[PDB]
């Protein structure tokens, strides 16, 4: 009864059935992490909630170069309590791995439980601004996604991408205007952040306002070229 | 007190069911999408079809713009009157 449809990228599917929906093919079947629904069509598929994860919001907002492919290594900064990092582990599958990072402790415990559930997730519960304590653990990621809230966002991204990014690599930022400035217009703040990344050698390619999902949040996709 | 308890129970019933309904629904984004280029000749030369390597409605559609090589509704029953009817039914609910 339900119909599957591939996305513009790999590992992301769209269910056209009684209702249109965005789904991901399970690597682990029959076990839900945060009580999300599922669909079997027979193999298993898991709903991606764009309101509750800032990555699928950029997906439904349309994004050409999303660097997460299946057989790749992705570093997730700000994986709090595990939802979207479970989704990106689900879309990378067994070959690709995901190095999750978090600092706090109750989302840390939830992330540790979910990393006991899933094999591709490898969790770090360290200060995201001190990259050495997982420099001793992580090797040469292919692409970085980051969703933090500390206002030195370009600072921590420059640090982690100088230490871990593959050359010609990919880097995805989520930016919260109401947290970084909260007085000037969000377009001006995002242009200032784009300039900061361009200074710190991220050649940007696009940005995108997550309009119907969050207030004043944007996603910036850029590449890493000829650096270290 | 008993009246207010009854109204409060009804309100929480409807709040939880509205949460689940909006969780199972899906919307379309309407956001600003900028694309950074490096040369103004290319900036004047820009075309979204030529960029994404797609066609007309694929350009104007957001959640899926599959390329021409990715491309290269009879399964659903009465796709001109029924499917949109059920979608609008869920939205109205």
């Amino acid at each position: 009864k339900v119909v599957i449809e591939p996305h513009r990228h790999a590992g992301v599917y769209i269910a056209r059935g009684k209702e249109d929906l965005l789904v991901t093919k399970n690597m682990a079947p029959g076990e839900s992490v945060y009580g999300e629904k599922r669909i079997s069509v027979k193999v298993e598929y898991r709903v991606w909630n764009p309101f509750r994860s800032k990555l699928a919001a950029g997906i439904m907002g349309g994004l050409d170069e999303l660097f997460i492919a299946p057989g790749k290594k992705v570093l997730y900064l700000g994986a709090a309590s595990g939802t979207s990092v479970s989704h990106v582990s689900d879309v990378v599958g067994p070959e690709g791995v995901v190095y999750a990072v978090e600092f706090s402790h109750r989302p840390g415990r939830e992330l540790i439980s979910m990393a006991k559930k899933r094999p591709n997730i490898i969790p770090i519960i360290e200060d995201a601004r001190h990259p050495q304590k997982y420099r001793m653990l992580i090797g040469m990621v292919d692409c970085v996604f980051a969703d933090v809230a500390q206002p030195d966002q370009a600072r921590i991204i420059a640090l982690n991408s100088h230490m871990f990014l593959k050359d010609q690599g990919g880097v995805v930022i989520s930016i919260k205007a109401n947290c970084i400035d909260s007085t000037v217009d969000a377009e001006t703040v995002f242009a200032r952040e784009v300039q900061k990344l361009r200074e710190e050698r991220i050649k940007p390619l696009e940005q995108l306002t997550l309009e119907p999902y969050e207030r004043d949040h944007c996603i910036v996709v850029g590449r890493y070229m000829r650096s270290g | 007190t008993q009246d207010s308890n009854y109204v409060r129970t009804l309100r929480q019933i409807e709040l939880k069911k509205l949460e689940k309904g909006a969780k199972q629904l899906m919307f379309k984004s309407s956001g600003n999408h900028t694309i950074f280029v490096d040369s103004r000749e290319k900036m004047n030369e820009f075309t979204p079809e030529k960029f994404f390597n797609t066609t007309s409605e694929m350009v104007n559609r957001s959640e899926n713009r599959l390329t021409k090589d990715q491309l290269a509704n009879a399964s659903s029953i009465m796709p001109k009157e029924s499917l949109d009817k059920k979608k609008l039914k869920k939205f109205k609910q």
Binding site: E5, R16, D20 | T55, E57, M58, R61, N64, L66, K68, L71, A72, N73, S76, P79, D84, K87, L88
Partner: peptide, 27 residues
Amino acid sequence: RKYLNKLIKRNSQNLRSWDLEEEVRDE
């Protein structure tokens, strides 16, 4: 070439028939 173009057009027509709307869009 033209055959490929027609095939792409057919697939696009299928996708459009999947996800299309008239005044249903504004509604």
